[PDB]
């Protein structure tokens with residue numbers, strides 16, 4: 210019943226500072242431009258201990274399935290090959306991606322009727338707000 214409040218289909222409604230976040234991650238110009246235009250959905254489901262997060266957009270369709278606390282391989286939408294671990298901390302899903310001696314953290318939290326996604330790469334934070342589809 211862990212992540213019940215996350216389950217569902219969500220649509221992007223606002224973004225702030227995402228180009229700067231992508232620059233800090235190392236995303237190149239053309240991918241920043243096209244991927245920054247995208248308006249993904251996020252489809253979150255749970256089956257037993259396995260959480261699945263799918264993100265569909267005109268740019269790319271991605272999907273991850275995982276167990277909390279258990280590292281996995283992920284290919285990001287910008288084609289990074291990262292080692293990811295996702296945990297639940299005080300009701301927030303905390304997703305750490307490691308690659309090339311670098312690290313970024315993505316937090317997903319329910320706030321009112323929204324699902325708020327905060328992405329942090331060193332000093333740079335981007336906030337993306339999703340609402341139910």
Ligand SMILES: Nc1ncc2c(n1)N=C(c1ccccc1)c1ccccc1C2
Pocket residue numbers: 231236244245247249264265266267268269270271285286287315326328
């Ligand atoms: N489908 C789809 N399309 C576009 C994007 C995207 N997913 N996902 C994100 C993203 C964002 C925050 C946390 C996790 C993922 C992503 C990652 C890097 C570069 C571009 C995008 C945009």
